[PDB]
Symmetry: C5
């Protein structure tokens, strides 16, 4: 798995409150977090399929 | 059904206001609740279809 | 049309601002209202197709 | 074009913040606006394809 | 690539909190920004496919 997958989730400085997915290396699966709408880091997925596939396994 | 289906819905500490479905085991069916965006428990579904099937 | 279709739309006590459809008997058609995210009443449709077929 | 296509967009009294399309006469095309959730007038579409076909 | 791809994203004056995409020329791809719901400039895409197609 990519090492960005080990990064904690980042809401960012913007004000939206949008559901995104992030991989939790600890839990071993992707989980939800609130994304603010700008400045996403890479452990941030619009689709849970993507997060699982990119970071899971 | 899994045991998690018997647990009351859990909004969590985040501040978004998203509709999710939870299984109401008293009523025998899935209903909506407001989820906050993080730290979901398992009786929480984005799709009512999945809720009814999983906890059905 | 089911009798619940005659009921006025029910936002409910939760805090979300979700758009839903409610059949408006007076008007002869389904219209939008803001739903709270919990404790819906039956004149409450996520899909307007569903609202008209069920209530129209 | 339907005459309602000429009407300015109507946010309405409810307090959701929904993106909708309306047709702009001046501009000659559909643009986005913020719909509040209730009391829509007709120059108001969920679909931009619907807006453009109906009013353009 | 179209000149408008070089313009900075424009939230506009309305009060919605909606995610849209803008081409970031300096960065080489499209990113997200919060769109207020009205008065879009052209470097604003509802679809990221469309953004990278139009502007990449």
């Amino acid at each position: 798995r990519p090492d960005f997958c080990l990064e904690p989730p980042y809401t960012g400085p913007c004000k939206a409150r949008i559901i995104r997915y992030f991989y939790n290396a600890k839990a071993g699966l992707c989980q939800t977090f609130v994304y603010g709408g700008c400045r996403a880091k890479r452990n941030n997925f619009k689709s849970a399929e993507d997060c699982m596939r990119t970071c899971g396994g």
